[PDB]
Design a protein around this ligand. Sequence first.
Ligand code: ASE
Ligand code: ASE
Ligand code: NAG
Length: 345
Amino acid sequence: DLRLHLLLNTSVTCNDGSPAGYYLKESRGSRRWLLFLEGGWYCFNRENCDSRYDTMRRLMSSRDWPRTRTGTGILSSQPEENPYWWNANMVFIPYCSSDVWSGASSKSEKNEYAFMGALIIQEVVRELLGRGLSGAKVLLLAGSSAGGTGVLLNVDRVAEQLEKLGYPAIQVRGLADSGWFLDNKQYRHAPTEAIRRGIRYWNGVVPERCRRQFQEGEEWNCFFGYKVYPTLRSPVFVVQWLFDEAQLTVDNVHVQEGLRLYIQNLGRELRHTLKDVPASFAPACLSHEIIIRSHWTDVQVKGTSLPRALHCWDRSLHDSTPLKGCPVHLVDSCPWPHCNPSCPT
Ligand SMILES: CC(=O)NCCc1c[nH]c2ccc(O)cc12
Ligand SMILES: CC(=O)NCCc1c[nH]c2ccc(O)cc12
Ligand SMILES: *[C@@H]1O[C@H](CO)[C@@H](O)[C@H](O)[C@H]1NC(C)=O
């Protein structure tokens, strides 16, 4: 089990001003550190956040967090469940800022809620340095759903923070699961407007190179993987279902020719956005399932599982071009959900 630590800097808070925190299981014989960002949508104005506070309060407050959590999937310490990184130091960072991990705003007399996701990540990193992270060789910042987009928004800032604090030897990398969305035409009649409003409400921050491309008022563009990814310097592995259920939901899809063409075009567009992403795993499945699930080993693309592809990615980032039998770019080409037989049932 991973044990809860509330942040010692109690000014770095969840939405309601309670301290943020992290769950940690140390592995003293390992210099690998996995920091996982939880997902769970977001809220973008007072009324929308008030509703979330009533029925999704664990995503807005630490007051009711349990003392422990079990690590599952890529956070499992069992080699049978986690062939990739079972011996790593494991960190689960609860999502309690409702800001896609982008916020840097405290509660005040003008702000009913604090949106501090970007500061929570930096404070977790800072406090972990005293608990053994100072000796790391690899810090993998991973995350699912809103946490996957959170990886894209924060991985280079973690890399910058460690460099400025005096740790140039820690290799910071990202693993973005289920956070790679398209600002596409909806099937029926938006997220882009909700994100636009959210960024202003949260004082949301995006990576500097992406911000400089899109400029003031247009920071929402950097929440879309295919736009922010080319601006990132840290190595990032992208995991994305071609027919992601959150994508389809915001596209108002829940089969006649118009919908068939819509779904096929979505898969093709997703495939296209990954063509120049050398470390990626994109199965042709309709799913909301994420990499902290216990059976994450089961899905394969071209006969290669995700734990294998991640291992191949580790090999590709050794100090010493492609590896025989150890691929890292795995994108399905078949055009309909479950045309891959290994898709989750
Ligand atoms: C699902 C969706 O609306 N995607 C478009 C907006 C968007 C970009 N990044 C995100 C991360 C989490 C999330 O809940 C929505 C988004
Ligand atoms: C996921 C999502 O938000 N899609 C909508 C993006 C969007 C906003 N305005 C639009 C106008 C034309 C279009 O082709 C797409 C959009
Ligand atoms: C706590 O965090 C805030 C926000 O990052 C920062 O301004 C402040 O200096 C921190 N306090 C201490 C004692 O480090």
